[model samples]
Target: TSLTVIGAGLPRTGTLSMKKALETIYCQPCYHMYEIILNKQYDISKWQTLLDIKQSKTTSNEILIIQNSLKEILNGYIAVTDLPACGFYRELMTMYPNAKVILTIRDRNDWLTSFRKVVLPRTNDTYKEEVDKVNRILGLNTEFDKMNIDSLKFTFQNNQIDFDDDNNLLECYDEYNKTVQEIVPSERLLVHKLGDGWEPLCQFLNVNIPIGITYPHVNALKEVTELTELLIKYQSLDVIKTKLSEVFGSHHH
Candidate 1:
């Protein structure tokens, strides 16, 4: 069919795992933030325009225009998860009326742990320094601070998740799950909490579980930290120097 899954979960809430699970069930591609990250060809400007359209005087064709933008973005994808996709799950629910909505939730404190390590712009001094260092070299449009902040406002309908307070973020996470539960009809919504695994998902989607394949759990803290640190070296001179020194000793130089 067409666009059969709407993911209402926040980033770092087992979204990557959901993406993999959905793709396997549908045997088709899913749209995740990783898609935009790796491809860099998605019409992000169009996505921004959607936010703009909703922000100002409501157009007579507001829903139509917004739907068009979404269709263009989603085109072939059978499911969507993670920010900007997760942020727009409400719209997606309307556009794909029959599609099931899965809100992958997690323990708030656990979420913050993964969020800080992998996704969220951290408060740590070293983190900010390295973020600046990387952005300076990469010339990225999605800066560390603006990226998650934008998603926070978009999904939560305001900027509620303040970076300085972990409690604020945790509270917002709880509220989002609460909001999603209230909004979506129970029959159409699956609140897929972390580790509730394949049966609930497959039952919701009406897909038989694949016999031997274990449910995918991905983007772990250690793996994500490894990736981040690897990329950090691209911008950190000291890290690069240390690695080089290990390979070619100072004496050898």
Candidate 2:
């Protein structure tokens, strides 16, 4: 199926829970940063192809070209949320006019601390230590680093915000919301704040809330810690699988 929802929210904004919620509501896979970090598909190159094109003014010819590449990257997913995908909200909205956009918003101060803690290890040394622990395990190659870093830079519109200037990023959170308001017609966009349960979101998508299910609120710090191990595992997954297959190829049966 095609996209039914486009999430324009940054991570640590309950994105994991939103990913889960969207998957449940749409009954289809929802693309998250996790999917890319896990390298579940040949996603690295497909997204690279789309993201590599230099910034250009939107035109019919350009739109169609970008649309095809984006479709290839997002094929089979019913919804997309969090980074990498959030950076492409404009393109996804243009490509899928019928799909509604959901901007999962939060308090600026709260989001600032959360973003720094989880996303910017350079800003917070403890997180740097934590990330370093995982980075060493992944052989320090930093493919994940380059991909997400570029995505964030694009999201902030070519890295205009200075990482050295904390206050610059402080204003950026609202800047994006205001811009989304300008780009998206009010009816087509839902500024779903943190803790806004199923009522508004379900109504926006024209779906009934699943009975007896409480809305999800996933802890961001835990996701980073748990998902770290998964990435380390995934980095070696191919080698492990091939080695096992080679050893077990000659079956007694």
Candidate 3:
């Protein structure tokens, strides 16, 4: 009915595995970035709205509106992991005060390496045109639309720093973890490393640990590559082309 587990972890931090584990423990669908990849109807516009809310000034009424907007976004999901959801972890925590938060973490050095290999590559110039096309069709505003690398830099790296600068990226990573640690109350949070397995997580959520359940480790690179290829393959389909033509034409006029 409502979110019971809010993953404050960013993508590539073993979130996909946590998504599966949460679904089993909580017996409800756990949202992940793959949901957006598979479901064109996942309401990405609402996510854009949350970004809008985060960027602007707001009154109490506006705050309430943002709260309601998030509630609608999670209407049927009992747990959530990965991006868009991860981006709004604090807001979701505020909205669902009683819900538990999972700060899934990994080794700082490994995370940086994985981020460069898995995430930075998504910003390849080859995908730019199609990325722009999808955003236009959805009337969505995202830095990822034109250049994914720029979006990644702005999201995780300091906006003023160079994207290739490993030092700053590591700083950003540490600062983000520090922010989550500072913000989340100890009792309501689980600071988990990927290999700690299901025991700690189940204990935190007050659920029974299932037998023979090994901790999962789902990597994102292969699936990400497949999705990227599929998008490029289908970019010329009339259905997608027509939707983009409609939205882009409407916008420019």
Candidate 4:
């Protein structure tokens, strides 16, 4: 492929902005977990394909042809799931020697709290009365539960059910952090906080930053605070629909 960049960070860790940056610099298509789930059959095996290119091919011509489709891939244009079936990121670097990686880091407490608030309602979209309202109105759930892949790191089966309530969530996050730390080399990886602005990020991508560049890095606490507020203020779905719509936008199905 033209380029492959693994977004090996936790969910709340500013993955959105990082994906956008990579798409702009690399010009390869980038697809996040959302896209992969929506399509339902994306090949997470591109890592293997890249491995083949690394071993057998050498010249730019050969690499480009094998990776021709990747070249057309703009930065944010490939399949993305979480942690990937064990050894994805290491194999991916082989395809693009010069590939840059962006990893987002967040505080463990904040990450756990945020995940619980946003995801708890999503466990059974149909069971919770509030979720059903959203489904009827927007045909969606706030958690984007449909985008949840069984193999992904945050997959409910693999992660915590209510991250705030149990040690399981912390354990999973710790494991993910450890795994990421072990796999990505320091020089190849950039450990950035979600709040850090774009200049350093642009420098990492090796692109000239124009004046007045605004990179949006939000939704950090909304998931946590909003859901907590909802529990206290509104006990039902209808009230939640109005409140959530205001924040998520009133665009309904």
CA lDDT of each prediction against the hidden true structure: 0.78, 0.78, 0.71, 0.53
User: Candidate 1: deviation at residue 81, Å?
Assistant: 0.4
The residue ranges of model 3 lying beyond 4 angstroms of the native Cα positions read: 40-42, 122-162, 220-253
The residue pairs found clashing in candidate 3 are none
* Each prediction's TM-score versus the true structure: 0.85, 0.82, 0.75, 0.57
lDDT of prediction 1 = 0.78
Q: Estimate, for each residue in 1-253, the C-alpha lDDT of model 3 and write its tens digit.
A: 7889998787688898999999877778888766765563345656665555655467788888878887777779999887767766777888887798998899888888677665542345454465455445544356433233332333453445665667777788788778888888899989889699888998898888877777677766677556545655655477787888887766663
Clashes of each: 0, 0, 0, 17
Model 3 root mean square deviation, Cα atoms: 7.8
User: Model 2 — which ten-residue stretch has the worst lDDT?
Assistant: 48-57
lDDT (10s digit) by residue, model 1, range 1-253: 5899998899899999999998888889999877765675345566666766655556667788888889988988899998887877777887888788999998888888777756655666356666555544554565434554666677777634467677877777788899999989999999998999899999888889978899998988777767666776554678788888888885653
Count of backbone collisions within predicted model 2: 0
